[PDB]
Ligand code: HAS
Ligand code: HEM
Ligand code: CUA
Ligand SMILES: [Cu+2]
Ligand SMILES: [Xe]
Ligand SMILES: [Xe]
Ligand SMILES: [Xe]
Ligand SMILES: [Xe]
Ligand SMILES: [Xe]
């Protein structure tokens with residue numbers, strides 16, 4: 113009655129957290145794999161349906177890297193601009209987003225669970241999984257198009273009510289966020305409609321693998337920024353308040369998301385540095401652009417670090433490290449995204465090496481990559497999500513958080529963080545030692561003797577994150593069990609951070625508000641970067657027979 | 663406090679952004695260096711070279727594995743390498759040190775990797791495409807090829823061997 | 829207030845991390861070269 117949007121937004125989260133909970137179960141078993149330890153007969157006892165290592169890795173990849181992150185993005189980046197405008201979201205369309213998302217999942221899930229789409233979360237042809245995985249996933253990803261429209265609508269609506277007036281902060285973020293995603297989602301949408309779906313039904317019998325994965329990485333890179341920015345939004349707009357501080361700049365936050373809208377899509381060739389049939393020139397062009405999309409994050413590193421410092425100062429910040437201990441290390445809604453941001457430093461450092469073209473051949477498709485992105489998505493994006501419960505969950509439900517719940521929150525987060533770091537040294541090191549990724553290497557024990565040292569590390573992180581994961585489900589399935597609804601804090605607004613305004617907070621902030629212009633700059637840049645090469649590949653299309661080997 | 667930290671903050675922000683654009687530039691120049699030197703061979707050749715994968719171990723240089731090593735210049739040999747269902751053809755690959763080894767790799771089934779341990783050679787192998795990489799092995803001995811792409815159930819067991827003569 | 833000495837050291841650590849990662853792999857690229 114009071115707020116129907118709360119319900120969709122909560123149901124998005126719960127299902128997202130279920131997906132996480134399920135996928136992540138395979139994690140510790142996989143971490144132990146790269147520790148040369150074969151915990152997989154043990155896994156069979158718990159789940160007889162787990163046929164192969166790589167079945168798990170598909171499930172752990174789909175539910176966690178695709179599902180959970182999109183659901184979370186679909187909650188945060190829709191619910192927040194809404195509550196910030198106070199205007200109601202189209203609940204007819206806002207249940208269309210969730211309902212597509214739940215069924216589409218179930219349609220896709222069933223093949224995978226039945227060992228019918230064991231093709232990994234990248235599904236590179238001629239690897240041919242079951243048709244229902246391909247269909248279901250297509251539908252699940254299309255839910256975001258409902259989500260795009262929903263948020264575009266409130267913008268259009270608020271634009272009428274207050275004419276001439278600058279867009280409210282969070283709104284601005286979520287508008288260019290959903291605009292960028294649309295322009296990016298196309299790659300996989302194209303690949304799915306034109307190539308995957310026909311092929312999988314029987315309409316065609318082969319697929320050209322090069323364009324299949326060119327179109328995939330078109331979307332393959334902006335999708336990761338589609339997972340990140342929700343965390344960034346919270347980190348910009350809720351964290352400074354959570355630290356008991358403020359946001360040092362409004363334009364610099366607006367500039368970040370602006371640069372992402374522009375630069376997050378026309379970079380995707382950095383996944384195809386090894387791929388045959390693409391001019392080195394176009395790779396060096398995408399190599400420089402990937403370093404460019406790195407700028408917005410470096411900016412983020414300075415705006416957020418200052419915000420934190422400035423907060424710590426107010427709370428009795430002392431000397432150089434004096435402001436750090438001033439921050440509220442007891443509130444887990446603060447602690448979680450901050451530990452993730454520390455981990456974001458080596459992961460971001462990894463990401464830059466990865467983008468240096470020639471330097472990729474040193475690490476491409478080795479364990480280095482798992483080590484890199486787990487510091488990104490499974491560290492920052494995921495710990496922020498876990499933290500965005502301790503402040504957002506009481507909001508949607510009206511239910512309070514106790515003391516031993518809150519102390520469980522610090523214990524869960526620190527162990528989860530401390531585990532991803534141990535795992536990073538392990539995988540990175542093993543990667544430089546030439547250990548490939550996506551390999552059940554524990555089945556072949558004597559194969560990599562040189563990595564006996566970083567292997568122990570992955571065992572150590574194996575146990576650590578296991579204990580963390582259990583501890584977490586306990587916690588989550590303990591707020592959702594008790595019925596102690598206290599509907600005052602329900603109405604009590606979200607912890608939005610106060611901002612600093614100045615004399616020049618209008619010139620640039622108005623320039624950036626020209627969304628319609630930049631979206632057509634965004635559109636031009638994709639066309640300019642992906643056009644010549646995609647046109648080339650279509651004119652030499654070489655489809656090849658489907659295969660299944662699992 | 664506060665009001666003071668918006669003047670100072672747009673100064674440091676600019677200066678930090680200014681620093682970063684040159685830090686990244688200094689990478690671009692160094693990425694360029696490697697592109698101009700000899701080491702740039704490991705970058706796949708641009709120009710498409712399609713093939714028929716089902717009819718590749720009958721018709722084409724990927725059929726007779728004894729013919730894989732073919733001299734194609736005063737000091738340059740080409741090796742026609744096959745990446746198939748959990749093995750590499752030929753096994754082993756004998757090539758002379760100091761020579762420009764031009765690898766030409768393709769697949770009759772799924773996508774595999776060609777990761778030659780101890781070299782910069784790390785190239786995706788695609789069904790219906792001929793990946794062309796170039797390397798000069800300076801040091802004699804045994805090298806080992808690992809497949810670094812998920813190619814099905816046997817993936818983890820998929821290794822190759824390259825022997826560089828003396 | 830006056831001079832963000834903390835956040836500077838924060839992006840200092842980041843700068844020093846990016847370099848060791850980047851230089852460290854540039855050195856390895858050249859050994860394998
Ligand atoms: C959320 C998920 C992800 C993020 C974020 C992410 C970031 C980057 N990545 Fe990536 N990535 C690549 C390039 C980048 C670059 C340039 C960035 C950049 O956006 C990163 C920039 C980050 C920074 C410049 C860090 C800034 C630091 C900050 C913002 C923290 C400041 C801390 C504070 C303020 C706290 C201090 C507090 C105190 C109290 C002191 C490349 C190559 O160019 C590959 C291919 C590798 C290969 O060949 O296989 C790749 C591979 C992947 C894969 C593998 C996919 C697969 O299976 O094939 C995934 C899932 C992934 C996800 C993500 N990636 N990436
Ligand atoms: C319990 C904590 C976790 C552990 C111990 C863990 C461990 C691993 C390891 C070792 C791999 C590489 C395996 C291989 O390539 O053979 C992997 C794959 C992966 N994980 Fe995790 N993981 C955890 C949590 C997560 C979470 C929460 C996410 C989602 C944000 C995630 C996303 C991914 C992705 C995208 C891959 C790549 C799948 C592929 O290559 O197809 N992981 N996991
Ligand atoms: Cu061939 Cu993995
Ligand atoms: Cu990318
Ligand atoms: Xe798909
Ligand atoms: Xe998927
Ligand atoms: Xe899905
Ligand atoms: Xe899609
Ligand atoms: Xe994708």
Ligand SMILES: [Xe]
Pocket residue numbers: 332333335
């Ligand atoms: Xe991806």
Ligand SMILES: [Xe]
Pocket residue numbers: 178233300335
């Ligand atoms: Xe995807």
